[PDB]
Amino acid sequence: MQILLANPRGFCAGVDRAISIVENALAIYGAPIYVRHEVVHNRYVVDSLRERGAIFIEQISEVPDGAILIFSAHGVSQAVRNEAKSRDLTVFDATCPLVTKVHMEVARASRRGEESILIGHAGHPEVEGTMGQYSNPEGGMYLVESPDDVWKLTVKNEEKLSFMTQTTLSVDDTSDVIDALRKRFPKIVGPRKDDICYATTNRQEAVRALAEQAEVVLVVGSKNSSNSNRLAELAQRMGKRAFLIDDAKDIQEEWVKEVKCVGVTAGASAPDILVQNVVARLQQLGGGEAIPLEGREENIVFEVPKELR
Numbered sequence: 133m134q135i136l137l138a139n140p141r142g143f144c145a146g147v148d149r150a151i152s153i154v155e156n157a158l159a160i161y162g163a164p165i166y167v168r169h170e171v172v173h174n175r176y177v178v179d180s181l182r183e184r185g186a187i188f189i190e191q192i193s194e195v196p197d198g199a200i201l202i203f204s205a206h207g208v209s210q211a212v213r214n215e216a217k218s219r220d221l222t223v224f225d226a227t228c229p230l231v232t233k234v235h236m237e238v239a240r241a242s243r244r245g246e247e248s249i250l251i252g253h254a255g256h257p258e259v260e261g262t263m264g265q266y267s268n269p270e271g272g273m274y275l276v277e278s279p280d281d282v283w284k285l286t287v288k289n290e291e292k293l294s295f296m297t298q299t300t301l302s303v304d305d306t307s308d309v310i311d312a313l314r315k316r317f318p319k320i321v322g323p324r325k326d327d328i329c330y331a332t333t334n335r336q337e338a339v340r341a342l343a344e345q346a347e348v349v350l351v352v353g354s355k356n357s358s359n360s361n362r363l364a365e366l367a368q369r370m371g372k373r374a375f376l377i378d379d380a381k382d383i384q385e386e387w388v389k390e391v392k393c394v395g396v397t398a399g400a401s402a403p404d405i406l407v408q409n410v411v412a413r414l415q416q417l418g419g420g421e422a423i424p425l426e427g428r429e430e431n432i433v434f435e436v437p438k439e440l441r
């Protein structure tokens with residue numbers, strides 16, 4: 133059995149920065165350090181941080197007075213940011229710069245009383261934080277997930293309309309939704325394409341190339357990781373068996389029995405050590421040396437705030 137490794141895969145610049153923010157805060161101020169929601173959607177990463185002294189909570193209420201709080205990489209609504217500022221809490225924002233960029237555009241549209249439409253998945257923290265940057269009752273902030281949602285959306289003034297998107301969506305599906313928005317609201321304005329980040333675009337492109345070579349694709353990443361799910365979904369749509377797994381232990385023999393070529397990739401929040409262990413498991417299951425595919429070079433790095441260096 134041949135083992136192929138997608139490239140790029142794993143940690144993106146935003147994730148690496150968010151994790152370093154928590155680690156450095158812990159090294160500078162010692163434990164405990166409170167973090168609102170998982171800093172990134174990866175069970176292993178979160179566990180490792182708890183070991184170092186981090187405490188993940190869901191609501192600011194859970195955070196004691198005088199404690200250090202860190203916002204997750206997915207970002208937060210203005211309400212949350214205010215709720216933390218109205219408290220005696222020291223805050224460090226690990227929101228990825230690429231998410232913040234979308235945040236700004238929303239707040240901007242909100243100040244100009246112009247309605248905005250976000251393409252994203254309801255309930256995801258990034259969606260909650262981005263929708264949460266709009267607060268002008270004279271305009272509006274609407275969420276759409278598919279062309280169908282677009283087909284039934286009604287706006288106050290489509291003459292002044294703009295759209296934004298979640299950073300981890302399916303490049304293909306988003307394209308379909310944007311096409312619908314333009315046919316519905318011909319005057320709508322937005323980015324040249326979308327707000328899907330380079331890491332998301334690159335990992336989908338890479339898993340596509342992997343899928344055309346492997347019969348089975350294993351995607352390392354947690355169930356709640358939006359970008360990771362998009363990778364498995366893409367593989368599955370190409371007709372290949374694809375599984376989203378947190379670690380080597382989830383691998384079931386039947387998935388790779390008599391399989392000549394298995395591909396492995398990882399979401400933007402999955403550490404390389406998890407991929408290494410998956411490769412080791414595949415090797416005892418008959419796999420040979422893992423062969424890395426040729427791929428897009430990524431060179432962007434996001435530094436932690438100077439205050440935490």
Ligand SMILES: C=C(C)CCOP(=O)(O)OP(=O)(O)O
Binds near residue numbers: 171206231299400
């Ligand atoms: C911080 C963002 C947006 C993405 C990176 O990883 P994640 O796995 O942590 O979270 P999602 O893809 O679910 O957004």
Ligand code: SF4
Binds near residue numbers: 145146147205229332
């Ligand atoms: S996946 Fe994209 S937007 Fe989300 S943390 Fe990584 S680089 Fe930032």
